[PDB]
């Protein structure tokens, strides 16, 4: 009849109805009542006279702050009583003493600060008690003394500081005890005395500075947890008095040294996780314990694994031994249940074929950051299914393929000196692979090092038009440079400054011509097979030599242009006639070019970035400093060149032959501008270029100045024909 709901099986629910007092008019025969989420501030004297047959009473969240001592009188049959989330500042000592048949009492989530001495007296049948999320400052020893029949006590989230001796002496029937999230600092010697039936003990999030010696008085422990504490040592035989332990939580502590036989004779332990125990030297002497499923030791100084590991631990499934100083590996035969093996960041230096022999149910193997120097061919043959296998950052000259046809994810990152390549005919199921060197994945599954259009496995160039243009440019440049050099050298015993500069430029173009010829020959050799050659080029000195030659040719061309501009400026400003100075400048141009080339040689990994050997490959150059400085100097030289040439530009000496020189300088500057700007593309994200297109553009820009200059000189200088005719006398 009340505004709240009802139930057929003698149950009444009135949660969240906003009641201020207990509901009236309900049936006298009521077995359960719920008044939880109403706003009731007090229970009067005669509150529950109309419900003599109550068995369950709920008042959680009522904002209850007063209980009359006679309010609960007459509820002799009451069995469950909940009062959490109210504002009871203290335990209701007088109110609840009449509940003879009470079995469950919830008082958590309150602001309890004091417990009267005579509290809980007369509660013979009490079996469960909540006191969590209160402001208690010490264990209520005497109030608990009146509860011999208690089965589950929890005192979490309080401000307990220390537990005195014989605190729970009379609670012989207790089987669950929670004490986490307290500020406990010290445990007395006999604090847990008489808790012979305790099965779970929780001590997480406390401030224990030393391991609790009291747990030696617990003979029936099954679960123990003391993580998030400040414990640093588990001296020896700490769990000697707990043969039945199954689960231990100790994985968040400043652990530094756990005893050699700390975990010893624990025949029912399941998981053993120790992290950061630096001072540990030997393997834990965990004899007797033969029921392990996970064994994790990290951050220690363990130098060896015992041979008897899983011939004893036949149930072992996960074995993590990362970090540490494991140098040798004992044969893992008998490890039939091993699913995951982790040995990363160790001193393992080889895997003989007898190491991983005999394992069937293996699933993941980790060997990263080790010093593995060699693996025998059949070392991986014996194992069954494999899904992961990491050998990243080791010294593997060779890597066998037999027995890894079932492999799924493979990681060899950083395995430099692993030159000889893999093949897809054995590795069939992979779709995850990352390899050292470069373009090892041209045969292959999503490959991490996929760099298509940069170092294709098919051929260096690929485009027929690009290859034909490169070959034609190389041949024309070679012929023109040879003819010009021969003519300049045979012209006379003495060469005018302009003639010397022209001869120097023609000689310098020879470097670029040779580089282009070498690139064309490599592409021809790599036609349809470039991939295999690729690494050979990158690892081999050929690519570095080609890149250095290209850089030197560019520097020599820049130096020759600068020398010509300086001579023109001196002529237009003065005459100096410093032939010795001109020779010195010509000689020092070679020194500057050599310095520029050695700049990429002092650094490592510069020329190997791409098969083209270009100083500015796709993406930002790791050697940002020198790479940017060279381009900046090359661009800035144009400012001086323009300042010098302005005198002739305003009148557009150029009277004899300067016309060809100016055109050559302009063409060289224009060709240099695109390639130079491409090096700064990574900084300016607004500009993006496709890999193949960028590669072709760079290749075409590089040869053009050498392809052009001889033609612009001979084809635009009548002095060329004059010298040819004069030197023809040597032929006759």
């Amino acid at each position, epitope marked *: 009849a009340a505004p709240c709901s009802c139930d057929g099986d003698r149950r009444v629910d009135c949660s969240g109805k906003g009641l201020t007092a207990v509901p009236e008019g309900l049936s006298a025969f009521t077995q359960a009542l719920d008044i939880s989420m109403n706003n009731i501030t007090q229970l009067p004297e005669d509150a529950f006279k109309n419900f003599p047959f109550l068995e369950e009473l709920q008042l959680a969240g009522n904002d209850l702050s007063f209980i009359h001592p006679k309010a609960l009188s007459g509820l002799k049959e009451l069995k469950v009583l909940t009062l959490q989330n109210n504002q009871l500042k203290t335990v*209701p000592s007088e*109110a609840i003493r009449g509940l003879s048949a009470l079995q469950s009492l919830r008082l958590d989530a309150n602001h309890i600060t*004091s417990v*009267p*001495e005579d509290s809980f007296e007369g509660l013979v049948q009490l079996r469960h008690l909540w006191l969590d999320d209160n402001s208690l400052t010490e264990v209520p020893v005497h109030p608990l003394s009146n509860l011999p029949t208690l089965q589950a006590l929890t005192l979490a989230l309080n401000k307990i500081s220390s537990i005195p001796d014989f605190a729970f002496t009379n609670l012989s029937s207790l089987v669950v005890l929670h004490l986490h999230n307290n500020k406990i600092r010290s445990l007395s010697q006999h604090c847990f005395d008489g808790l012979d039936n305790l099965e779970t003990l929780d001590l997480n999030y406390n401030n224990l500075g030393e391991f609790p010696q009291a747990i030696k008085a617990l003979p029936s422990l099954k679960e123990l947890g003391f993580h998030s504490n400040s414990i640093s040592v588990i001296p020896d035989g700490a769990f000697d008095g707990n043969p039945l332990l199954r689960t231990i939580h100790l994985y968040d502590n400043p652990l530094s040294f756990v005893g050699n036989s700390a975990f010893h004779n624990l025949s029912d332990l399941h998981s053993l996780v120790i992290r950061g125990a630096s001072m540990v030297q030997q393997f834990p002497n965990l004899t007797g314990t033969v029921h392990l499923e996970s064994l994790t030791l990290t951050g220690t100084k363990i130098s060896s694994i015992p041979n008897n590991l899983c011939q004893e631990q036949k149930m072992l499934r996960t074995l993590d031994l990362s970090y540490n100083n494991i140098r040798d590996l004992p044969s893992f035969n008998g490890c039939h249940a091993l699913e995951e093996i982790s040995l990363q960041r160790n001193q393992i230096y080889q895997i003989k074929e007898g190491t991983f022999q005999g394992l069937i149910s293996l699933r993941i193997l980790d060997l990263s950051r080790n010093l593995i120097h060699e693996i025998h061919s059949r070392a991986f043959a014996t194992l069954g299914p494999i899904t992961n296998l990491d050998v990243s950052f080791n010294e593997l000259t060779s890597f066998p393929t037999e027995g890894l046809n079932g492999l799924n994810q493979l990681k060899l990152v950083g395995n430099f000196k692993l030159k000889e390549a893999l093949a897809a005919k054995d590795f069939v199921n992979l779709r995850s692979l990352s390899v050292p060197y470069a373009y090892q994945c041209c045969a292959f599954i999503h490959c991490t090092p996929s760099t298509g259009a940069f170092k294709p496995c098919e051929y260096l160039l690929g485009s027929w038009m690009i290859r034909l243009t490169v070959w034609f440019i190389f041949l024309v440049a070679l012929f023109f440079n040879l003819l010009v050099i021969l003519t300049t050298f045979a012209s006379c015993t003495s060469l005018p400054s302009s003639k010397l500069f022209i001869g120097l430029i023609s000689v310098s173009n020879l470097f670029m011509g040779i580089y282009t010829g070498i690139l064309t020959f490599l592409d021809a050799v790599s036609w349809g097979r470039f991939a295999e050659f690729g690494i050979w080029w990158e690892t081999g000195s050929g690519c570095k030599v080609a890149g250095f030659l290209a850089v030197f040719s560019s520097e020599s061309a820049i130096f020759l242009l600068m020398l010509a501009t300086v001579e023109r400026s001196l002529s237009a400003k003065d005459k100096s006639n410093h032939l010795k100075q001109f020779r010195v400048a010509a000689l020092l141009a070679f020194l500057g070019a050599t310095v520029a080339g050695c700049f990429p040689l002092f650094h490592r990994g510069e020329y190997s970035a791409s098969p083209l050997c270009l100083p500015f490959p796709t993406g930002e150059t790791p050697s940002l400093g020198f790479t940017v400085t060279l381009v900046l100097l090359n661009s800035l030289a144009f400012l001086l060149m323009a300042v010098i040439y302005t005198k002739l530009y305003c009148n557009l000496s150029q009277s004899s032959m300067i016309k060809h020189v100016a055109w050559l300088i302009f063409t060289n500057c224009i060709f240099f501008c695109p390639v130079a700007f491409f090096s700064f593309a990574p900084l300016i994200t607004a500009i993006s270029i496709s890999p193949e297109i960028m590669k072709s553009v760079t290749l075409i820009f590089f040869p053009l100045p050498a392809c052009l200059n001889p033609v612009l000189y001979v084809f635009f200088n009548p002095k060329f024909k004059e010298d040819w005719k004069l030197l023809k006398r040597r032929v006759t």
Partner: nanobody
Framework: GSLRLSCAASGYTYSPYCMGWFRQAPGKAREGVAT???????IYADSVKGRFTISQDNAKNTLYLQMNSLKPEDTAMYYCASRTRAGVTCGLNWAIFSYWGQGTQVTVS
């Protein structure tokens, strides 16, 4: 105001173990005012340390609480409470008392 807040115990006469005065603001919890035990030891609240004074006439069970110079915060309903057995320490805790009175009103304006 010379406000005498008297009490009277009508059940039994022989000295109960502890007798206190408490107060309640409308709708809030019961916090103590004063307590006195069989030996005559006396306890007061911090806000009550000086203004009030708890007395007793044991032979007659008339237990007064004297208030003077009442603060405006002192508007509440006051309860006289008692306890018989000795199994607790005396103090301003509402959960130890066994018998509670109907209380009265003191409106300080």
């Amino acid at each position: 105001g010379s406000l005498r807040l008297s009490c009277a115990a009508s059940g039994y006469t022989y000295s109960p173990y502890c007798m206190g005065w408490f107060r309640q603001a409308p709708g809030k919890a019961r916090e103590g005012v004063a307590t006195v035990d069989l030996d005559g030891s006396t306890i007061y609240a911090d806000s009550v340390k000086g203004r009030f004074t708890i007395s007793q006439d044991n032979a007659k069970n008339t237990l007064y609480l004297q208030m003077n110079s009442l603060k405006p915060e002192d508007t509440a309903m006051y309860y006289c409470a008692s306890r018989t057995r000795a199994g607790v320490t005396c103090g301003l805790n509402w959960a130890i008392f066994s018998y509670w009175g109907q209380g009265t009103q003191v409106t300080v304006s």
